[PDB]
Amino acid sequence: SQQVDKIKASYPLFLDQDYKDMLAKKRDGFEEKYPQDKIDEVFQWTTTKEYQELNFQREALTVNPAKACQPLGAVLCALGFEKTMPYVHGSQGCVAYFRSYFNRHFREPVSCVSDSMTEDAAVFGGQQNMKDGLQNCKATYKPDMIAVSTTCMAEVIGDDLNAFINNSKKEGFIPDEFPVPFAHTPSFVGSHVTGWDNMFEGIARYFTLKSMDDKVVGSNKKINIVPGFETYLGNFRVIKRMLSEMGVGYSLLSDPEEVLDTPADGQFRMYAGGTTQEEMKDAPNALNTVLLQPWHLEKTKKFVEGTWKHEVPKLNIPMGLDWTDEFLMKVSEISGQPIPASLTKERGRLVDMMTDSHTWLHGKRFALWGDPDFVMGLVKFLLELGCEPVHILCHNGNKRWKKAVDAILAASPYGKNATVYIGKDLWHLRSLVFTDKPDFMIGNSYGKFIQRDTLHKGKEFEVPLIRIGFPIFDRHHLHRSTTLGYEGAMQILTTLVNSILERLDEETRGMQATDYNHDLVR
Amino acid sequence: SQQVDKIKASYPLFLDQDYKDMLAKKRDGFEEKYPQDKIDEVFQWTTTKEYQELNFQREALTVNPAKACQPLGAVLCALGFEKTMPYVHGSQGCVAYFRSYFNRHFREPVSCVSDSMTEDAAVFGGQQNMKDGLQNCKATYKPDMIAVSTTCMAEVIGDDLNAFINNSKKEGFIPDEFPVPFAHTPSFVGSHVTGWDNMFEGIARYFTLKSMDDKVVGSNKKINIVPGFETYLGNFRVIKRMLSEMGVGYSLLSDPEEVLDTPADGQFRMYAGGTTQEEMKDAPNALNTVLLQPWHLEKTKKFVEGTWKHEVPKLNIPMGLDWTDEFLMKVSEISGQPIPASLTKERGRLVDMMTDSHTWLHGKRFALWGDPDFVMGLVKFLLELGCEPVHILCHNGNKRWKKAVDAILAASPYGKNATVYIGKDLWHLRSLVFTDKPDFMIGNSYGKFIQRDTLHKGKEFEVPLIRIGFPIFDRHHLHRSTTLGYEGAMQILTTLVNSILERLDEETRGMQATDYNHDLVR
């Protein structure tokens, strides 16, 4: 039953009495549900510490992971080059899932194609798929370049990309001068950031390996910027702005910020902006190359050091105060350009905000999960704010990264509580936030269920989630936020302090019970 | 009793058993408090329609007003000029309150000076107070200009500002060439925006009315922008940014954003930025003058059209999409500069966000209170988004503004269930949101109590508050936000949509009760 003036969607239409009776009848009659007391007992058991020892013990079962597979990162990297079509060699379900994932995160069109490999290719390989797909995509969507990745099916088959593409060009499917860079991106190795690294190295090697003879380091007086797997457009924008305000010539390599943010003006643009092939070709002429996310750019670092002869600086992600200062210092030293007064004023404003918000931030406990570089930058910023990161989780982190993060936590009195977990999923984190309750979580949308679980134990055990990372699905336009730089640091500070204040306001809102602390001024 | 390793502040130390028992003993023994049932019955009566009729028959009592007195806006306007000291003729408690208010909003140092008027002055006037105060302020804080505003006490006793300033100049207390503009700001007329208007008119008359001999309209190829009473620094930033990429010549009159955003580097700067006296003197030599908030810049418009011979355009506040378009087109027509492609892409991105967020925004009911221009721009944007502004409240509005807002509402099909209230306060809005429940409230921090009241009636009756306006005391660094232009529209849209989504997330977090609608993807 609906009233035409007040139409109700599933919530709260299914809270009506007739629907409640229907659901009760269904459950009682045909579901054979466990007794509610048994369910409550099992839930309370899952809360406890003996459950956490069982949950930690598992060496095979993964529950609610916090990572994706390599071709997702490969597609994201390929999207950052001008008039380039990402091309995934394998089955079409991969491409459908990648496009849906990025569509839900960015709320923008995502263009990617596959060669739709089937049982025929499972038995006889996928060379004909490669030839037909290359010709079809070049004829239909007219790209200037096609970047080829692989799914797990291609890697198990052992189909090789180089021979397939060379045979495609030799047999007249595509012109011999058409650029077709490729990379092998097995989904059973690493994660999506590894796929980004592999694709970037493949493209860079495609454009800058057979002509090193006339390349002179520093001839164009520019600095190469390699962002890595980045899902915040504000980070690209802030890097560009900080380098432009400093009078520093730069080349942002694989920047997708234009195609991932296109105006709605009555026409659809499949391509927009991107790194030009000329910039890729001229990259070895640069003074140096800086990697914004070193911990998932390793093969790229090896290629740039051993082929372009660039002395890549040892820099951390420009997150927080100290690391942004170090990044600006290294850029100034390399380019010979002094830091202007605008950046100094911005840093002073960040320090002003830190001193203004310090009293609320001091001693807050945070549980956080994300990609290695992002997690370590967030931990560093939390330490600089006086906050306590008590649970640090990185599903795609290694032991060297864990050692570096532990060393970072050792140099501050706010990391005594902190412990670092690698290879653990979000079920482990649910156990951690149950047995050792923090004040807040910092992560992607998948943490919204953990909050839910905590709320089931009671309001005094609820751990609110703060949405920073990838992917964010239940909020709108948060992908336009900036995490990098002084601007990113102040945005993160505002989010953290206002989340704390909102939680306090919610807790102290009960009339004549807790509203004595419902202060107008905070 | 406090644990050394977990110390408790007022919440929730006072929820301890002994404190609860002590409070119960106090209330039962000595408070002589009304019985709880009587309290509940009175509370329930306060939420009914009969109480609404009684409360709307008020003629003399004001409860919880949504405005401030006149000299506050004058102080804010004076802060927008270079090395200018706001000086208030009257008693010092007024200045103490002004400084405390602005410190709590901006979380920045605010400098104001008072002549410390007393009952002995009330019977003899404040001429000696003015002389001594001017001399001491000039000798102590070394300003290049002192701007004078009047307390209600100075206005009642009829102090002549011009005569007192002239006598101070003539008797050697201050140099005769020292610029000392003055304005009469009676706190029993209008509100703070009227004070901003009065002070700006006084300063403009001080610098330009006498020198009409060498002024030619359109000489310096610049446009004058008068922002009015504005408490978002991002508004000044966005206005300056949009004109600069356009390349139109511009002259911002009375901007305090550099003073209200000063870096923390180890030194305190009493003055920073502002508009030079040369800019004020060169103001009549411009092609035109644009008023950002016409509905409280009235005397300024009269002075500009009478003395400067400028044809002030009939432009609304650049809030939303259509009014930003009109502002940009008018600036293009006046300055002869075309609208660049960057502005077009920003507008397209705003439209893209509107199309992506439209389904959640559509049909939502909003109750909004604030300054006239801000309220009307918010109503325009809400109608643009497909939202329904039900209760529109403006304490310091007038009949003409009410007619204009009624016309705007009638021009759109979403303003059918809309009522505009002028001269009403937040108790009226409490009654309105109790009897005609909207989905959300939009306003300053004083609405946080209304929400509390609604939550006392029931969770299903609670009306969440969205903090957009002045002043905001319980949230940190929200004064750095933007409201004007495409950027401000984007920020407001993000705030609205994500507030809706957090409310929906809260409503569906109940395990096995409402969590069937706890969607990961929204």
Add this chain to the structure above:
Amino acid sequence: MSREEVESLIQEVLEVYPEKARKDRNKHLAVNDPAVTQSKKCIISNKKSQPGLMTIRGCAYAGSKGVVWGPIKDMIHISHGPVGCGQYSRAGRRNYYIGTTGVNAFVTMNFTSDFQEKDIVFGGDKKLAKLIDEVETLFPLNKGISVQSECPIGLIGDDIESVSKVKGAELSKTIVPVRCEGFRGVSQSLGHHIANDAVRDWVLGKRDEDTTFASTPYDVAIIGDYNIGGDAWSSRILLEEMGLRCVAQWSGDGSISEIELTPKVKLNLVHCYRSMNYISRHMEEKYGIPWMEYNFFGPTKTIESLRAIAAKFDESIQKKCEEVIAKYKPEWEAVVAKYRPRLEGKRVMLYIGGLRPRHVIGAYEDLGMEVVGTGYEFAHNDDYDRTMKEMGDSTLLYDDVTGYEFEEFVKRIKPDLIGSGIKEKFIFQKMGIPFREMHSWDYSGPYHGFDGFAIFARDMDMTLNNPCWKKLQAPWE
């Protein structure tokens, strides 16, 4: 340290000022000598502020409304006059109360007459009567009305006393007028005096002839505790652990009933001398109730004050007192053992309007912290008489300090921490000096008692040591 250097510092600050301003401000600056016991011989106070010097004190309206009358929960307080004055003081000072706002509690509201031009030129007594009737019909559970005058009320010829008398005779309601016009006096102190006179003249004598209240030989009334962040409750838990019975607290979380029942108590414990000494003197003169001063800032002062209270009662009170001190010794001992090593030897400079700079010193010295300079915005001579003996030798004392003077003082002295009002909070944070909001406990607290000392130490530690104060300087300059 080095009195001659401190004297040279004072004189250098004085030189920029004009002759009259310098001559006046000379007498408000002093160097503490503990042997000196008469403040008027070296330092002067309670004088008119010098115009145009960016002073810090408020008006009489602040001292009456926002300080004394404001925290009374079941009264409705009307800011009579223009709108802004009552708007700037709404919920700006936090006094904790237990009640339902809108029904029986009205502390965090702004009732105002909202004066316009017609009220200024034609008076506002008729509007006052209409407002009283509207308050009666819309808020039926209010147990009394207060009318706080603003500047134009006294400046125009308005008579609120007659309106109050007529309306209170008609509705049988307590309606008190307060002539707390801002231009009266030089600071908030005269507001305290006027509010106390109003309480004496209209509220105290209501229950004089009524003797239906059972009396106990352990009856005490708290005067001058305004429950800032829950301070009064923290003191009251200790008092009731001593076995006493608190009939009233003035005026934080206070009610008209406790104010009326106050004359029936055996002792008056006055926490704030400056604001509420007048009412206690009147009580002693009329009802013969002795009053004494106590100090719950810090474990040392708390223990001394508790023993002092116990010394005015029987042996059971002293025994139960000794038991409370033994019960709470380990908690504050652990607090000290945790936080003293991180605050030992640090120097502070505090500027608070009255009572608190002398009071707070015991809590600081307990944490091993030295106050190298202290000042009062509105305190009288007797406050300074207490301060001199409460202060260390060769320290700086200031009265009605201006922004320039305080700025130069901290620049030359370089204290490790400053405790002051919000008007100075962001000024001294931009210099890299850690700052603590003494007036509002920085939205934290309470600070009194063994329960509040832990919060005090924790807040001091976190402000004094932070990873922000070391980052003010960009590392490329």
